[PDB]
Amino acid sequence: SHMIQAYLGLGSNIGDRESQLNDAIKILNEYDGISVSNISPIYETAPVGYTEQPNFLNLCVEIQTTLTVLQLLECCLKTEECLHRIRKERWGPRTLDVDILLYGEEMIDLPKLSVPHPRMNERAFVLIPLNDIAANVVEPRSKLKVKDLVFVDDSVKRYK
Ligand SMILES: Nc1nc2nc(S)n(CCO)c2c(=O)[nH]1
């Protein structure tokens, strides 16, 4: 029951993107061991990786959690599988990504999981919305607080 403060990164680029983010937050907070305590603004971001796909909506969430980072990962995975289910086949699959960004001030390096991801520092679609809710949290790989990692990126803009 020692509570860890974690940050998650959420994204959806196809379907009702905002409603997808919204549901993921709700589902995560429904776990006995997770309490959603803050949410960033939503940002519309240009796709990173494949450039030929729709824009994402991204946000980040602060949680107070008594789960271990792997149990938290489980909750993330279950939430993805759940909001991926088709609504109507002809509409196609729905989308949602939920990543653990920060878990207390710990560096976690397991074969199935790295928290923070070592390349998270590259991602404005993460850092910008992260900075709205975790500006003063130290990202342990770099040793920089999130407010000092965040950089200018015009491909990321507030959505509402
Ligand atoms: N802008 C942006 N690009 C992305 N590429 C992938 S893959 N993803 C899914 C997150 O890993 C995203 C994303 O959430 N936002």
Residue numbers in the entry: -1 to 158
Can you list sentences taken from the study reporting this PDB entry?
Hydroxymethyl-pterin pyrophosphokinase (HPPK) is one such enzyme, responsible for catalysing the transfer of a pyrophosphate group from the ATP to the pterin substrate, 6-hydroxymethyl-7,8-dihydropterin (HMDP). All have a thioredoxin-like fold containing the binding sites for both the substrate and the ATP cofactor. X-ray structural studies have revealed that major conformational changes, particularly in loop L3, occur throughout the catalytic cycle. The pterin stacks between two highly conserved aromatic residues (Tyr or Phe) and both the substrate and cofactor are fixed in position by a multitude of hydrogen bonds; in total, they interact with 26 separate residues.
To investigate the factors contributing to the free energy of binding, we solved the structure of SaHPPK in complex with 21a. Attempts were made to co-crystallize each of the strongest binding compounds (21a and 21c–21e) with SaHPPK, however diffraction quality crystals could only be obtained for compound 21a. These provided excellent quality electron density data, and a high-resolution X-ray structure (1.85 Å) of the SaHPPK/21a binary complex determined via molecular replacement (crystal data and details of the data collection and refinement are provided in Table 3). The ethyl alcohol pendant projects into the space leading towards the Mg2+ binding site, making two hydrogen bond contacts with a pair of bound water molecules. 7 in the SaHPPK/8-MG structure has been displaced in the SaHPPK/21a structure, and there is a tightly bound water between the hydroxyethyl and Asp97 which orients Asp97 in a similar position to that found of Asp97 of the EcHPPK/AMPCPP/HMDP structure (where Mg2+ sits). It should be noted, however, that in contrast to 8-MG, the binding of compounds 21a, 21c and 21d was found to be 10-15-fold weaker under saturating ATP conditions, suggesting extensions from ring B into the space towards the Mg2+ centres and the ATP binding site leads to competitive binding with the ATP cofactor. Titration of 21a into 15N-labelled apo (data not shown) and magnesium-loaded SaHPPK enzyme led to broadening and disappearance of several, common peaks in the 2D 15N HSQC NMR spectrum, which is characteristic of the intermediate exchange timescale, and indicates that binding of 21a is not magnesium-dependent. This is similar to what was observed for the binding of 8-MG to SaHPPK and is consistent with the fact that density characteristic of magnesium was not observed in the X-ray crystal data of the SaHPPK/21a complex. While the spectra appear to be very similar, however, closer inspection reveals that the sidechain Hε1–Nε1 peak of Trp89 (in loop L3) is only perturbed in the 8-MG bound spectrum. This is mechanistically interesting and may indicate that this region of loop L3, adjacent to the substrate-binding loop L2, is involved in binding of 8-MG but not 21a.
